[PDB]
Design a protein around this motif. Structure first.
Motif, short mmCIF file in Angstrom:
data_model
loop_
_atom_site.label_atom_id
_atom_site.label_comp_id
_atom_site.label_asym_id
_atom_site.label_seq_id
_atom_site.Cartn_x
_atom_site.Cartn_y
_atom_site.Cartn_z
N UNK A 155 0.86 -1.29 -0.21
CA UNK A 155 -0.06 -0.01 0.03
C UNK A 155 0.81 1.22 0.06
N UNK A 156 1.95 1.23 -0.93
CA UNK A 156 2.68 2.57 -0.95
C UNK A 156 3.77 2.68 0.10
N UNK A 157 3.82 1.99 1.25
CA UNK A 157 4.95 2.11 2.30
C UNK A 157 6.08 1.07 1.88
N UNK A 158 7.21 1.28 1.92
CA UNK A 158 8.35 0.40 1.69
C UNK A 158 8.46 -0.43 2.73
N UNK A 199 -3.70 -8.59 2.84
CA UNK A 199 -5.26 -8.68 2.98
C UNK A 199 -6.00 -8.14 1.72
N UNK A 200 -7.26 -8.35 1.57
CA UNK A 200 -8.03 -7.97 0.50
C UNK A 200 -8.03 -6.61 0.09
N UNK A 201 -7.54 -6.61 -1.33
CA UNK A 201 -7.45 -5.16 -1.88
C UNK A 201 -6.18 -4.65 -1.82
N UNK A 214 3.80 -3.41 -4.89
CA UNK A 214 4.64 -2.75 -5.83
C UNK A 214 6.01 -3.17 -5.89
N UNK A 215 6.67 -3.80 -6.98
CA UNK A 215 8.17 -4.31 -6.88
C UNK A 215 9.00 -3.46 -7.73
N UNK A 216 9.95 -2.34 -7.62
CA UNK A 216 10.30 -1.78 -8.34
C UNK A 216 11.95 -2.02 -8.33
N UNK A 217 12.67 -1.98 -9.43
CA UNK A 217 14.05 -2.22 -9.60
C UNK A 217 14.63 -1.04 -10.45
N UNK A 269 -3.87 -7.67 -4.52
CA UNK A 269 -4.66 -8.89 -4.21
C UNK A 269 -6.13 -8.80 -3.94
N UNK A 270 -6.75 -9.97 -4.68
CA UNK A 270 -8.27 -9.75 -4.60
C UNK A 270 -8.55 -11.16 -4.03
N UNK A 271 -9.29 -11.33 -3.11
CA UNK A 271 -9.72 -12.57 -2.53
C UNK A 271 -11.01 -12.86 -3.68
#
Lengths: 280, 280
Positions: free
Chosen positions: B203-206, B257-259, B263-266, B276-278
């Motif tokens: 969610x945008x936190x490293x 968790x659901x929703x 993000x993976x950045x190189x 992630x979608x349940x």
């Protein structure tokens, strides 16, 4: 019915086995795996109209030479596990063998020098998938079994336990290329009954023995378990595990030497017999 | 050079990326994996003359959607391993992800109920093989690298550690159907410099961070080590491992968790971003 991949004319064919050394070519298919991509593979096998072949054991290829998936189980023989004095597992151990490991049921296992230090046998039943199996329930799973064959889950124990040291991933000791005898042919479930002996021989001495109907996880249970994680396709293989008597656990510890032959036999399926040969 | 597999309504193409959202079609191929089977793939890509296209992020497919082998590494960032108070490994840890697990670099990870209790991220570099590699020495190994991309080694930690309890085989936790984003595209080694940051964001936190040049085992070392056990074909994938900051290791333990979006950045390769979608 019995289905083989046979080397002939510098290529391979799928063939209906008619006796220990005769078969009928099933036209249009290089191997049993390609034949199982057809929904009407049984009809095609029953109508085999290709060349009559008389074959030597060493003309048998790996019965399914190019499966997309080979999923291998760890402990699975109840009586073996109890003799070790531990609990029956409630979850299947699963690890992968790449198709590059497969060889003919009578082929020499040619081992390079870096891999030859801790060679071990694991005689096992193979279950070959008959159609795409996704999220299959145990009650329906027998419908997805094309048939059975024999495999040696041929192991490099030093690679198997290398990394990480406390909880080693077995894959790198379980996927040496051109190591795992697979055949001699696939027997369909109408022509096989569980209960017969699975036995492994080293140089003619019996080193493994178990009844085939002593599984903790049945092929049907293994299909349900695996296919809720990822699908199995037609031509994919489940190797259902080995009993006790592996060289690594013997007293004294015993590994396969240069020139030594491992035979794996399942009463009702036939046998494979692979000579270990150290590279030049 | 950067190569992408792009979904175009009912068809898919291999394409040379020209900008963040434009490419040139490489005529004759459905995806980058098919393209790499050709010995002169590099010239075909460099001389791409097909239709110019514009693509949305979510139209990118897994850059190599059907590799025959995805070989995954365990611990491989030296400073991470030392900070946990561990010796650096002498031997690579290796386990298999089936290509069934691959999704597009912006695709949703759709997770069934029985798999959703311990979902975890592992932001990693992917190494894509550009020609058949068998018993390749480290000094020659860079000739076998087509390029690099980004993968999420998306994990079900409850499955990963399930069996057997004392030395679990991770595979069943590492191969969930349609779980692992892969792309956004492949950058050729001439267009990439090691040293930039590999980072993962929940969610945008490293949640993970390493320089890409802190490997214990280089791409070249992993090619040498793996190809002395079995060969790597063109289009096959080595995933070179993850640094610290996985949710399983955190205090408290944080799972996806659901929703929630990972993000993976190189730096130098781009990023992937999978929500992630349940299911249902």
């Amino acid at each position: 019915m019995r289905l083989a991949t046979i080397r002939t004319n510098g290529t391979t064919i799928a063939a209906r086995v008619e006796s220990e050394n005769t078969a009928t070519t099933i036209e249009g298919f290089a191997n049993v795996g390609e034949l199982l991509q057809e929904s009407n593979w049984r009809e095609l096998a029953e109508n085999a109209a290709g060349e009559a072949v008389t074959f030597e054991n060493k003309e048998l290829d790996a019965v399914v030479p190019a499966p997309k998936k080979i999923v291998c189980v760890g402990l699975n023989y109840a009586n073996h596990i109890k003799e070790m004095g531990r609990d029956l597992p409630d979850t299947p151990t699963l690890f992968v063998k790449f198709p590059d490991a497969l060889i003919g049921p009578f082929d020499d296992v040619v081992v390079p020098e870096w891999a030859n230090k801790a060679l071990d046998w694991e005689g096992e039943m193979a279950v070959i998938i008959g159609k795409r199996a996704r999220r299959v329930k145990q009650a329906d799973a027998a419908e997805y079994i094309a048939g059975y064959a024999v495999m040696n889950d041929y192991t490099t124990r030093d690679f198997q336990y290398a990394a990480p040291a406390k909880t080693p991933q077995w894959h790198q000791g379980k996927s040496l290329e051109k190591s795992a005898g697979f055949g001699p042919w696939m027997t369909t479930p109408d022509s096989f009954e569980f209960g017969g002996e699975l036995a492994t021989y080293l140089e003619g001495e019996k080193v493994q023995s178990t009844p085939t109907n002593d599984l903790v996880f049945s092929p049907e249970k293994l299909i349900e378990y695996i296919t809720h994680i990822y699908p199995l396709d037609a031509g994919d293989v489940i190797v259902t595990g080995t009993p006790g008597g592996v060289g690594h656990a013997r007293n004294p510890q015993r590994y396969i030497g240069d020139g030594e032959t491992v035979k794996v036999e399942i009463a009702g399926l036939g046998f494979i017999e692979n000579k270990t040969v150290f590279e030049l």
